[PDB]
Scaffold this active site. Structure first.
Site, PDB file in Angstrom:
ATOM      1  N   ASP A   7      35.164  32.883  34.852  1.00  0.00           N
ATOM      2  CA  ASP A   7      35.517  33.664  32.891  1.00  0.00           C
ATOM      3  C   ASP A   7      35.555  34.876  33.062  1.00  0.00           C
ATOM      4  OD1 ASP A   7      33.797  35.248  31.001  1.00  0.00           O
ATOM      5  OD2 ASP A   7      32.954  34.454  30.723  1.00  0.00           O
ATOM      6  N   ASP A 105      39.591  32.835  27.639  1.00  0.00           N
ATOM      7  CA  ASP A 105      39.026  33.511  29.371  1.00  0.00           C
ATOM      8  C   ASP A 105      38.046  32.661  29.941  1.00  0.00           C
ATOM      9  OD1 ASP A 105      37.026  34.169  27.432  1.00  0.00           O
ATOM     10  OD2 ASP A 105      36.805  36.111  28.850  1.00  0.00           O
ATOM     11  N   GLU A 106      38.606  31.567  29.641  1.00  0.00           N
ATOM     12  CA  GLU A 106      37.377  30.767  30.290  1.00  0.00           C
ATOM     13  C   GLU A 106      37.987  29.806  30.576  1.00  0.00           C
ATOM     14  OE1 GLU A 106      33.366  30.483  27.457  1.00  0.00           O
ATOM     15  OE2 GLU A 106      33.187  32.649  27.733  1.00  0.00           O
TER      16      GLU A 106
END
Ligand SMILES: Nc1ccn([C@H]2C[C@H](O)[C@@H](COP(=O)(O)OP(=O)(O)OP(=O)(O)O)O2)c(=O)n1
Ligand SMILES: [Ca+2]
Ligand SMILES: [Ca+2]
Ligand SMILES: [Ca+2]
EC number: 2.7.7.7
Length: 341
Positions: A7, A105-106
């Site tokens: 993350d 973003d993960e």
DNA sequence: GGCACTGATCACG
DNA sequence: TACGACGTGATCAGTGCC
């Protein structure tokens, strides 16, 4: 199963800083300028120097200025962050074929076949944090455990720029002590319905009658919460296929005058078709955000793909179906495409 | 009774 | 002038249908 969750830290801010190093150390606030007036819009994300003082994602840009009038406010450059992201993701593909890209973003990596234990897992994480810092000079928190849910909760605890494991034994501790509202998937509206049943811990869901839980939050959320409680949550990492692509724009001033709304609708359609690129939709939905912020929508499925021309004409008909079936004023109009070929 | 679609709801990034 | 030059996936409740 062993799951590794990555993350990226305060992403939109960080990528800005990486593009302009002089920004490091100063509070940074990435915003979404709506255009209505001076500083109207919301904040997408703020780095930590700026978050220390209450400047977080969601608050009005004007509220953020009252708190940090001299912070560096930048306009969101979603296309930029997106490219940086795609490059970081690609890096992670060298650490497992089974990877689920959750959001911008993960990412979830099933490293069950790359490491024998959490010690080797934790070391693979470090190697991955580094590989990303090297290539893209971006820090990211790594969460590790038996499933996706606890891997995520892992990361939530470690960030920023951290790493953490939640072994089978701590999972058991959490199934008991972890506030149920910090469980991925439990929003405010649900967290309340649970507190309104005396449920504050995952375990508390095993002592209640199933139907009483079902009836209040839904059969899917109940099963979800129960499996985690019995510690039998099993959800494999699966490659995600984007199912829909849309766009919604705020109008200069509300209104329900078809002709004054058209430009915004067609604009939204244009951008949407650009983003579609090679994907052919068979379903088109016109979305509206009424003056009072409710969300209204009307759609249509075709036995064939939709040409932009078809979208144009058909969108107007649906927009109309919203005007003939609602009397409120529109504030944000947009289109949304799905059911790709 | 239960499969299959549609406009609304929730959560989250 | 108080959730976005914002987006997308999933479940739900209603209802069309064998
Ligand atoms: N309400 C929100 C939440 C997030 N984002 C975007 C900007 C964030 O940079 C990015 C990632 O989401 P996170 O919730 O993880 O937020 P950050 O990455 O900014 O911070 P952190 O992960 O350190 O908490 O998604 C957004 O536009 N609007
Ligand atoms: Ca996040
Ligand atoms: Ca993040
Ligand atoms: Ca929550």
């Amino acid at each position: 199963m062993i799951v590794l969750f990555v993350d990226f830290d305060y992403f939109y801010a960080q990528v800005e800083e990486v593009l302009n190093p002089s920004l490091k150390g100063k509070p940074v606030v990435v915003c979404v300028f709506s255009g209505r007036f001076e500083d109207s819009g919301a904040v997408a994300t703020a780095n930590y120097e700026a978050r220390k003082f209450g400047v977080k994602a969601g608050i009005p840009i004007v509220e953020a200025k009252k708190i940090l009038p001299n912070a560096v406010y930048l306009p969101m450059r979603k296309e930029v962050y997106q490219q940086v992201s795609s490059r970081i993701m690609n890096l992670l593909r060298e650490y497992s074929e089974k990877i689920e890209i959750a959001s911008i973003d993960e990412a979830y990596l099933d490293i069950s076949d790359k490491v024998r234990d959490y010690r080797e897992a934790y070391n693979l994480g470090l190697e991955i944090k580094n590989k990303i810092l090297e290539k893209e000079k971006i820090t990211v928190t790594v969460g590790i455990s038996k499933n996706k849910v606890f891997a995520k909760i892992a990361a939530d605890m470690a960030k920023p720029n951290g790493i953490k494991v939640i072994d089978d034994e701590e999972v058991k501790r959490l199934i008991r002590e972890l506030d149920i509202a910090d469980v991925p998937g439990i929003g405010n509206i649900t967290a309340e319905k649970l507190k309104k049943l005396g449920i504050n811990k995952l375990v508390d869901t095993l002592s209640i009658e199933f139907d009483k839980l079902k009836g209040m939050i839904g059969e899917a959320k109940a099963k979800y919460l129960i499996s985690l409680a019995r510690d039998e949550y099993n959800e494999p990492i699966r490659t995600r296929v984007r199912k829909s692509i849309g766009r919604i724009v705020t109008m200069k001033r509300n209104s329900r005058n078809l002709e004054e709304i058209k430009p915004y609708l067609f604009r939204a359609i244009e951008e949407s078709y650009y983003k579609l690129d090679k994907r052919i939709p068979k379903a088109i939905h016109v979305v509206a955000v009424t003056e009072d912020l409710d969300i209204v929508s009307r759609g249509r499925t075709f036995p064939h793909g939709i040409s932009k021309e078809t979208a144009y004409s058909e969108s107007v008909k649906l927009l109309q179906k919203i005007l003939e079936e609602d009397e409120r004023k529109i504030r944000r109009i947009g289109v949304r495409f799905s059911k790709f070929i």
